[PDB]
Amino acid sequence: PNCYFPLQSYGFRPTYGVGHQPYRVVVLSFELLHAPATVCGPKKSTNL
């Protein structure tokens, strides 16, 4: 009491509701500013 551990768990089991399932989240952060381009999209090539 009055002394709480900072972190608790995400106890995950195969049987919950959708709101409690272990969702896998991956976020992509881009830097679209004026700087030398380093990562680019899959530019498409064709015949001649």
């Binding site: 700087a35 030398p36 381009a37 380093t38």
Partner: protein, 49 residues
Amino acid sequence: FKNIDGYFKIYSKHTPIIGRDFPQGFSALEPLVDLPIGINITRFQTLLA
């Protein structure tokens, strides 16, 4: 070497040495690599063996 708008450029050309170390005949210089450095190059140094 040069650092225009970053994009460090290196040009090299190896000529089998003749009698003169730094002689005079013309020798073209070809690029080797160009990759985006983007840092304030002001000082320069060399390494030995």
